Design a protein around this ligand. Structure first.
Ligand code: SF4
Ligand code: SF4
Ligand code: SF4
Ligand code: FES
Ligand code: FES
Ligand SMILES: [Ca+2]
Lengths: 905, 156, 147
């Protein structure tokens, strides 16, 4: 199809919208109510152009660009007199009742209404009457509400209801006293409410975490990084100022995390600006905690490691590939232990086996939305990694999209699609120990013990293919729903199976692999996704190594007298008393970390590592793709006594001082070469981003905008002499604004989206070849995984039923989004969002114990009787007890374990 | 502490039977609650959301969208005088001044007895019969300012 | 009365056509009269209208084909199928066929509502059926349809 804009020919798509066709060509049409991921409505009338019938026409007709199809032979005009003055009138009407509080507003240079008011060229005011006001609401710890700034373009309610599936936001009121919010005052309980900050083109929904310690957009030093909070690895843009990380924004990537984050990754950045973090190397003798610089710490640590008889390195699933490899080179391969439990490592290894050896394609986050029937086995997807759950919601809405496409209505008008749909949902079958947040859209929810979910998966695989092992003891009332799932998955063109290592059982992974293989046997386009625990747990599994238990036995046995723990708390993956005894028995304990953990006490040497804001590194997604995160700022720019170096830098210099008695502050690309030369299966990590000697037309890329203010007074409170800019020799980025952030630049990684006339987060559409699609010049991160030619075998190990036993209790994980991450609980803004430490009991189990809901109970684990308040779980089963993993005192490895002495306190 | 009565719940379920969706019965459920208790309180929104299945935000949006769903406590009798054009030509300002003089209130306000609530109305649909005003499902036409205290004193 | 007398129910006059009728009293908004906003209000939503060219005739209430017709529109059609077709075209010598409930309103001698064929001049209605202006009014303006 071809169109004619201003008497100029253009070749656009015919099946898409005219507004997005014009915005894909680099043309500027103002818009408020249209979003590339939310369809098109007429809540504003901002995208008005003048359409003609044939080539020779003068009068025209004012149509909406977002509601006109971009069919073959259209003749539209954008910048004629009538459309321009009508759009000026529309911004005048929207700004007729708008508060005069732009300098005291949170948006400022991030506001879309400012850009579209300037773009339409409306400066003079002739409205002399009174304005309109509304009362504000308390939306929780993350979203500040300022309803007076609203222009009623309905984008927030459309996202929150249609896209996010939330039940909090909504439209109230009437003609002009319209309202967008909650019916009462309270916290937005959806896990995607943080996307309302950038979805709203005005300052209504703003970031409270960025409201505290606020700076403008041009004052932010940005970097492209990867969210370290769970395994989805959503591309983020952290931006800092004055030496502290201030706001994480969305970073566009049309393959993973196009437009929307989750609340955990959006608001769990508070742990990197804690004032109790290690900033300098600290060494203890007796009770004296003295402070060294980098060189003395390396010399002393190399001396003690040389005098030791055996060194062991305990890596972490939160550190980068470079840091874990640097530990793997500091210590031997024969003694290098991944800091995870044996069962969790086994689950991770079999999940990796299903990924890179199951012969079955694993989809990325964007293409989850194209599947036709989703079966989630064991995983609380909406609470562990919620972005896959949002993509599952979109995949469920794909059936309404298909029914609309059968009636030949265009795909960009979502109102007609939702009209045709009317609760027509793709089959979603979620299994969990209790209720999920996906139960409102799921075709069926299976509340059962974890072994029963595994047997359900094995029964599904057997009924889909008789070569799979059979299950004995299935009740016919459950066999009917088994048959329902079987005919739902068999008739699906693209079935999707979701599992993960957080389920706490090997057999759930086995059953999910069996179901995927049975669907692949009958010629279906089945995909599988597995939600891992941490950001780089899959990379640690690819790297491999022993478990944490083997390291502990090596510690109390006495075979190893030196331990180097890289960025691990060591209480989440093993019991606290055993780890404490093993570390106290060790003559030398080194802890390379950026968070003040519990094991840093009685640790003979502490290296102040760097977080994702202050380090460069590579992390592997749950799907297997290896993306890389860049340093945001130099920690030594302000208060230069702190060194705060990269973890791989610390370990490489320690290895160099161990070998040649001299330090070697190496480069990132040297470590990348070492990884791709030593580990053959990690050879793809030199394809995510180019080297540090990569320039677009001879210049680097700027971390900060061209209007970065206050350069000569930023450090003036401690030194009036302006220091030299920090030199970034590791990567392709410069720490000043003397770089390149042009949208038409041959690169894949963008620190921040800014275009002239587009100062909002809606400047990402200038950085893409087509808007709402993939990013221009490719996408960051390469897949690193190829589908095997042949699959695995049918896993014959089918577990038995869960029989409750007297005097013992099976522990079931719950995995809250705001409280089951080690780096998220340390954020001061999350502490009001996590629930109180609780324990769930069945009504029958509570009646047997005689305990009423809300009162304390006492249970003993590792010889420690702890008291927690109970609450009644209707969906839980008898003989089980429920716990929130990841919390303080409740390790994530406690899932699937036993419990004793549930006595009332 | 809102609690739906048995008759209200049976009426809501019976209206739910008439449609393809309980969401279609949301508006009639709000009208049933308004008829029974004079107005729709804050807990009634969650009660309708619980009996139906739709979110409470949708129920609140429906309750605050339509004009004759009162979310504030009103009097025992709602006076609804016509604000439109034909009643402006026939004269509604005289009867509005008469109502304001008799009740000593403003439109949108209620009397201190909790008896009358004065409100304007979009249109009564009885334009050919002079000025129009509706009190408690009873329309009144051919109105004059001098006939307002007589028409007001026959109500409870 | 219709569902008592065999009408409006199931197997109407032995035909086998099942049709049942409801009355949905609105909660009061002027926008609800628009057909797409009528559909949205009938579905118990906020009565915001919808966008054409997806029409109610192809996708209306709950995604099903519906049509919305006025009371007068549905009330002329029993006369068409009870009296005839050419009779309906031959009651007025104009291309707007049928009869319409015309009538003047607002400070006239006889405000009311009269059924007249199309092509009747407004001066005829005002000076004959409505009775014209009262003693002292000069008729400076009028609207064909109200407001
Ligand atoms: S609150 Fe923001 S997103 Fe919602 S309608 Fe108003 S301007 Fe649009
Ligand atoms: S939302 Fe935008 S236009 Fe409104 S006060 Fe804030 S900066 Fe100004
Ligand atoms: S889904 Fe996971 S990776 Fe993505 S923003 Fe949330 S916590 Fe971060
Ligand atoms: S962008 Fe709002 S009318 Fe098109
Ligand atoms: S103008 Fe008042 S009844 Fe219509
Ligand atoms: Ca660096």
């Amino acid at each position: 199809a071809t169109i004619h804009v201003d008497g100029k020919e253009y070749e656009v798509n015919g099946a898409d919208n005219l507004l997005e066709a014009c915005l894909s060509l680099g043309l500027d049409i103002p818009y408020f109510c249209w979003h590339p991921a939310l369809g098109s409505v007429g809540a504003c009338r901002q995208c008005a152009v003048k359409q003609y019938q044939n080539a020779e026409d003068t009068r025209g007709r004012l149509v909406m660009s977002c509601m006109t199809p971009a069919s073959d032979g259209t003749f539209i005009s954008i910048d004629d007199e009538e459309a321009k003055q009508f759009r000026e009138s529309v911004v005048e009407w929207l700004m007729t009742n708008h508060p005069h509080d732009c300098p005291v507003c949170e948006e400022g240079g991030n506001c879309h209404l400012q850009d579209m008011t300037v773009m339409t060229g409306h400066s003079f005011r002739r409205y002399r009457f009174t304005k309109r006001t509304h009362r504000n609401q308390d939306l929780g710890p993350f979203i500040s509400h300022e309803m007076n700034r609203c222009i009623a373009c309905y984008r927030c309610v459309r996202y929150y209801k249609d896209y996010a599936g939330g039940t909090d936001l909504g439209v109230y009121g009437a003609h002009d006293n319209v309202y967008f919010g909650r019916p009462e005052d309270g916290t937005l309980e959806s896990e995607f409410s943080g996307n309302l900050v950038e979805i709203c083109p005005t300052g209504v929904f703003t970031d409270k975490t960025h409201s505290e310690r606020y700076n403008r957009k041009w004052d932010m030093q940005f970097a492209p990084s990867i969210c370290q909070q769970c395994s989805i690895g959503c591309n983020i843009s952290p931006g800092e100022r004055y030496g502290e990380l201030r706001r994480i924004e969305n970073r566009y990537n049309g393959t993973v995390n196009h437009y929307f984050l989750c609340d955990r990754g959006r608001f769990g950045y508070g742990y990197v600006n804690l004032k109790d973090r290690p900033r300098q190397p600290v060494q203890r003798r007796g009770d004296d905690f003295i402070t060294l610089n980098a060189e003395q710490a390396m010399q002393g640590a190399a001396d003690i490691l040389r005098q030791s008889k055996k060194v062991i390195g305990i890596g972490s699933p939160r550190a980068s590939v470079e840091s874990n490899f640097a530990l793997r080179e500091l210590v031997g391969e024969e003694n290098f232990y991944t800091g995870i439990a044996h069962g969790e490592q086994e689950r991770l290894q079999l999940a990796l086996k299903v990924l890179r050896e199951g012969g079955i394609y694993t989809p990325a986050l964007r293409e989850i939305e194209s599947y036709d029937a989703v079966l989630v086995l064991g995983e609380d997807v909406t609470q562990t990694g919620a972005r896959v759950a949002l993509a599952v919601r979109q995949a469920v809405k794909g059936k309404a999209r298909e029914m609309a496409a059968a009636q030949k209505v265009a795909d960009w008008q979502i109102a007609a699609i939702l009209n045709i749909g009317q609760r027509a949902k793709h089959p979603l079958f979620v299994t969990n120990v209790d209720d999920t947040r996906l139960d409102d859209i799921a075709a069926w929810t299976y509340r059962a013990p974890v072994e029963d979910q595994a047997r359900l998966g094995f029964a599904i695989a057997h009924a889909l293919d008789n070569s799979a092992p059979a299950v004995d003891g299935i009740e016919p009332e459950l066999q009917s729903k088994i048959d329902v799932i079987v005919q739902a998955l068999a008739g699906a063109k693209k079935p999707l199976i979701i599992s993960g290592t957080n389920a706490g059982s090997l057999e759930v992974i086995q059953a999910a692999a069996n179901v995927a293989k049975a669907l692949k046997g009958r010629g279906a386009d089945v995909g599988i996704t597995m939600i891992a625990r941490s950001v780089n747990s899959m990379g640690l599994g690819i790297m491999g190594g022993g478990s944490l238990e083997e390291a502990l036995t090596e510690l109390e046995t006495g075979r190893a007298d030196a331990v180097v723990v890289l960025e691990n708390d060591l209480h989440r993956h093993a019991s606290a008393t055993r780890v404490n005894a093993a570390l106290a028995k060790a003559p030398l304990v080194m802890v390379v970390d950026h968070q003040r953990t519990a094991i840093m006490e009685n640790a003979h040497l502490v290296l102040s590592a760097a977080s994702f804001a202050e380090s460069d590194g590579t992390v592997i997604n749950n799907e297997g793709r290896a993306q890389r995160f860049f340093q945001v700022y130099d920690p030594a720019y302000y208060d230069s006594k702190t060194v705060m170096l990269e973890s791989w830098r610390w370990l490489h210099s320690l290895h160099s001082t161990l070998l040649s008695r001299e330090v070697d502050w190496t480069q990132l690309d040297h470590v990348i070469d070492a990884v791709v030369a030593k580990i053959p299966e990690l050879a793809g990590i030199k394809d995510a981003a180019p080297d540090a000697t990569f320039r677009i037309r001879g210049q680097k890329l700027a971390r900060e905008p061209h209007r970065y203010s206050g350069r000569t007074a930023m450090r003036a409170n401690i030194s009036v002499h302006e220091p030299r800019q920090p030199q970034d020799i590791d990567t392709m980025f410069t720490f000043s604004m003397e770089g390149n952030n042009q949208p038409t630049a041959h690169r894949s990684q963008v620190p921040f989206a800014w275009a002239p006339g587009w100062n909002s987060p809606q400047a990402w559409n200038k950085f893409q070849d087509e808007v709402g699609g993939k990013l221009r010049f490719g996408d960051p991160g390469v897949r690193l995984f190829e589908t095997s030619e042949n699959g695995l075998d049918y896993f014959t190990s089918v577990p038995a039923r869960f029989q409750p036993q007297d005097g013992k209790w099976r522990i079931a994980p719950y995995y809250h989004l705001f409280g089951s991450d080690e780096l998220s609980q340390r954020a001061p803004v999350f502490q009001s969002r996590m629930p109180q430490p609780y324990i769930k009991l069945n009504p029958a189990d509570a009646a047997k114990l005689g305990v009423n809901a809300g009162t304390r109970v006492s249970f003993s684990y590792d010889g420690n009787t702890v008291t927690l308040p109970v609450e009644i779980a209707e969906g839980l089963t008898a003989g089980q007890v429920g716990l929130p993993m990841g919390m303080s005192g409740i390790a994530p490895v406690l899932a699937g374990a036993h419990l004793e002495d549930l006595k009332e306190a | 502490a809102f609690e739906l009565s048995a008759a209200e719940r049976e009426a809501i379920e019976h209206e739910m039977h008439h449609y393809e969706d309980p969401r279609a019965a949301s508006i009639e459920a709000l009208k049933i609650v308004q008829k029974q208790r004079g107005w729709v309180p804050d807990g009634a929104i969650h009660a309708i959301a619980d009996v139906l299945g739709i979110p409470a935000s949708d129920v609140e949006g429906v309750a605050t969208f339509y004009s004759q769903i009162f979310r504030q406590p009103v009097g025992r009798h709602v006076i609804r005088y016509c604000d439109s054009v034909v009643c402006h030509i026939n004269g509604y300002q005289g009867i509005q001044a008469a109502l304001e003089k008799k009740l000593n209130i403003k439109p949108g306000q209620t009397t201190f007895d909790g008896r009358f609530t004065l409100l304007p109305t979009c249109c009564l649909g009885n334009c050919d019969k002079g000025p129009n005003m509706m009190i408690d499902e009873d329309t009144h036409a051919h109105l004059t300012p001098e006939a307002i205290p007589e028409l007001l004193e026959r109500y409870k | 009365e219709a569902t008592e007398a065999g009408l409006l129910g199931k197997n109407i006059m032995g035909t086998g056509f099942d049709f049942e009728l409801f009355v949905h009293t609105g909660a009061g908004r002027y926008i609800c009269g628009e057909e797409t906003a009528l559909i949205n209000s009938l579905e118990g939503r906020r009565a915001n209208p919808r966008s054409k060219p997806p029409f109610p005739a192809t996708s209306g209430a709950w995604g099903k084909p519906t049509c919305v017709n006025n009371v007068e529109t549905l009330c002329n059609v029993p006369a068409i199928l009870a009296n005839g077709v050419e009779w309906y075209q031959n009651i007025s010598k104009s291309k707007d066929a049928g009869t319409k409930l015309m009538g003047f309103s607002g400070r006239v001698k006889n405000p009311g509502l009269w059924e007249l064929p199309f092509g009747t001049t407004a001066r005829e209605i005002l000076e004959d059926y409505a009775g014209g202006m009262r003693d002292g009014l000069k008729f400076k303006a009028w609207q064909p349809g109200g407001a």
